[PDB]
Ligand binder design. Structure first.
Ligand SMILES: Cc1cc2nc3c(=O)[nH]c(=O)nc-3n(C[C@H](O)[C@H](O)[C@H](O)COP(=O)(O)OP(=O)(O)OC[C@H]3O[C@@H](n4cnc5c(N)ncnc54)[C@H](O)[C@@H]3O)c2cc1C
Ligand SMILES: Cc1cc2nc3c(=O)[nH]c(=O)nc-3n(C[C@H](O)[C@H](O)[C@H](O)COP(=O)(O)O)c2cc1C
Length: 609
């Protein structure tokens, strides 16, 4: 029954939709597709592949008229989402015969990235190779345009093709309107109420391994200090105690945390809607046959839902604004909301500008449209789930097996909406003061940002500002290896900053590593000081000769990390120029050479946006 197949049989499901999602876009699509099954007299369920063994696809043919659908997002360099990692690894190893398996894939991607929808394309071609039968063309959603309409366009052709394949047709029955109904609990034991846990009730208090996305380990914050000298920004370094969790990690991996929305913002929303946030309740699916019993962990209070389970800071979706329109008592306001939710060009234009680019959130919409008074229960099923935030672990498990370090800048800005916005996780992390204990629900997500297999292999690290994070772990580890008597190749760091007196992160630590010979070269650039701005790509260019040697003769591995995609672009272009000059070779040939390094695993990236 731990098999998704047996799980399906239990509830008479013939359609299962797996989601490879990291920020919830794919998950929601899977939820919608699963729900769609019903409009055709069939039954589906959405599912997190991480919770199952996809090799069980082999038993799916046991279910008559069964179909498996995949909504998969592609991340850094074509890599899968954290929750789809095991499925991806398995697909590459397996040679199982999937004859009799019917599938369809909808990929979530973005054309501006080099590996557009790589995950979607991989899963679709791989399943066919294994012998499964494609029932509908691969969908290629592009978030650089309008992912929603791509999904809608695919979906509208998908269902008729599936209904036809399985012999059914639309029922054309009631639309439903709302997906959940409100059930208040006048009296209820405190023991039955969720207080912020993600998986099993009281799983936060009764910490029991193994710990992962659905069972986060509450790590104690043992250190939380200010890294920068300035006052205009707040860069911080934190250390999370993972002792006794059995959680394993390596330099280059990521640590995800489930934050808590600002208590004051939660209060405001409750107040503007005139509701008692301390009311305990449950939202139950109107359709008793749906597998999605509740929108989030219930029973729980409105306060807890808004604080731990819901996204109340990002721009509300167009469908949310459409639904909200019916609650605006003022015509002009109702109409404005519809125009913003519409597909017209003016409508899209307005939404893009006034909602998205101005970074307005659910509270702002509520204040901006005072005639808008929706019941809080209906609002909660319209809001998206609060997502975990990922950070590059800045420590080496070889040196800190029981502690995971984080390096991050606190997010705070004046939005064009005229309000000040606060990053959800960084504001929450910033307030976590060591010593009861300040606990951070977290889990580790493996990455492929790994130090070379052989210690002798040279290492080149490029990263500006906070992008230095994973490299503190790398340097910690390389230094450790030297102490252990190993033969370690050169270790070079090309770091960029604004000012050495504003934000020159880890000065002391780097100086010590360099003095010990752990850090072969320490190259630092400051971009904000006089018209003459120096960036990391300039540091690389000034060191063209030595870098070419390490790359062409030394077999060095390259690593780039930072929050700016254009930074990675400029760094990459700089390496193209170095290869072109020292090969020597034509630019076009230099490009191929660098990309080859990437496919050969010698040029890794970790860009956060
Ligand atoms: C694999 C991976 C690794 C990462 N590693 C790190 C790391 O080591 N360190 C680190 O600091 N971060 C890292 N990030 C970024 C991190 O996940 C968080 O997004 C970031 O810390 C802010 O989260 P928040 O919850 O505080 O902000 P949120 O509340 O989620 O807000 C962030 C959003 O606000 C908007 N925004 C921000 N500033 C502005 C502005 N001036 N104007 C308009 N809109 C704005 C953007 O749309 C942005 O997406 C990583 C991301 C990924 C995907
Ligand atoms: C750090 C990061 C890296 C990404 N890398 C790629 C990529 O290589 N290729 C691609 O097609 N889309 C890429 N995308 C776009 C996502 O696939 C797209 O935004 C998707 O919708 C996110 O879905 P989710 O919310 O279900 O994770 C990336 C997005 C982020 C945030």
């Amino acid at each position: 029954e731990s098999s998704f197949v047996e799980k399906m049989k239990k509830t008479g499901r013939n359609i299962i939709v797996f989601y490879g999602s990291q920020t919830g876009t794919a998950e929601e699509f899977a939820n919608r597709l699963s729900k769609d099954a019903h409009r055709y007299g069939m039954r589906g369920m959405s599912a997190d592949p991480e919770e199952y063994d996809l090799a069980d696809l082999s038993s799916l043919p046991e279910i008559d008229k069964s179909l498996v659908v995949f909504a998969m997002a592609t991340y850094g360099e074509g890599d899968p989402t954290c929750n789809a990692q095991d499925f991806y690894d398995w697909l590459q190893e397996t040679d199982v015969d999937l004859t009799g398996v019917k599938f369809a894939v909808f990929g979530l991607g973005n054309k501006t990235y080099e590996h557009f929808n790589a995950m979607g394309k991989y899963v679709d071609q791989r399943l066919e190779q294994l012998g499964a039968q494609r029932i509908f063309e691969l969908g290629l959603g592009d978030d650089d345009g309008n992912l929603e309409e791509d999904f809608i366009t695919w979906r509208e052709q998908f269902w008729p093709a599936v209904a036809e394949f399985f012999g059914v047709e639309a029922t054309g029955e009631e639309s439903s309107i709302r997906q959940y109904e409100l059930v208040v609990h006048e009296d209820m034991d405190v023991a039955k109420v969720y207080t912020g846990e993600m998986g099993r009730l009281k799983s936060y208090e009764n910490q029991k391994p193994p710990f992962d996305a659905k069972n986060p380990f509450l790590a104690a914050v043992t250190a939380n200090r200010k890294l920068n000298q300035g006052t205009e920004r707040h860069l911080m370094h934190l250390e999370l105690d993972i002792s006794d969790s059995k959680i394993r990690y390596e330099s280059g991996d990521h640590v995800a945390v489930y934050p808590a929305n600002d208590s004051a913002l939660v209060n405001q929303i409750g107040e503007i809607l005139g509701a008692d946030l301390d009311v305990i309740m449950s939202l139950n699916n109107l359709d008793e046959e749906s597998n999605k019993k509740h929108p989030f962990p219930t029973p729980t209070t409105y306060r807890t839902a808004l604080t731990y389970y819901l996204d109340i800071t990002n721009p509300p979706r167009t469908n949310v604004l459409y639904e909200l329109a019916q609650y605006a008592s003022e015509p002009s306001e109702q109409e404005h909301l519809h125009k913003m939710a519409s597909s017209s060009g003016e409508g899209k234009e307005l939404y893009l500008s006034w909602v998205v680019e101005a970074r307005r959130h659910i509270l702002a919409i509520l204040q901006d449209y005072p005639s808008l008074r929706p019941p809080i229960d209906h609002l909660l099923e319209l809001l998206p789930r609060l997502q975990a935030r990922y950070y590059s672990i800045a420590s080496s498990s070889k040196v800190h097996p029981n502690s995971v370090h984080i390096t991050a800048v606190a997010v705070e800005y004046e939005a064009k909406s005229g309000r000040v916005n606060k990053g959800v996780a960084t504001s929450w992390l910033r307030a976590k003061e060591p010593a009861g204990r300040a606990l951070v629900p977290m889990f580790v997500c493996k990455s492929q940002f790994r130090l070379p297999f052989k210690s002798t292999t040279p290492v080149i690290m490029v990263g500006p500002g906070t992008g230095i994070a994973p490299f503190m772990g790398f340097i910690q580890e390389r230094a450790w290896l030297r102490e252990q008597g190993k033969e370690v190749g050169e270790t070079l760091l090309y770091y960029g900053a604004r000012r050495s007196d504003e934000d020159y992160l880890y000065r002391e630590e780097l100086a010590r590593f360099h003095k010990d010979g752990a850090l072969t070269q320490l190259n630092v650039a400051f971009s904000r000081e006089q018209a003459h701005k120096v960036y990391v790509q300039h540091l690389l260019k000034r060191d063209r000769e030595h870098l070419w040697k390490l790359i062409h003769e030394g077999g060095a591995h390259i690593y780039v990390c930072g929050d700016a995609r254009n930074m990675a672009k400029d760094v990459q272009n700089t390496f193209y120029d170095i290869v072109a000059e020292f090969g020597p070779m034509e630019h076009t040939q230099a490009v191929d050479y660098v990309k080859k390094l990437m496919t050969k695993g010698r040029y890794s990236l970790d860009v956060w946006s």
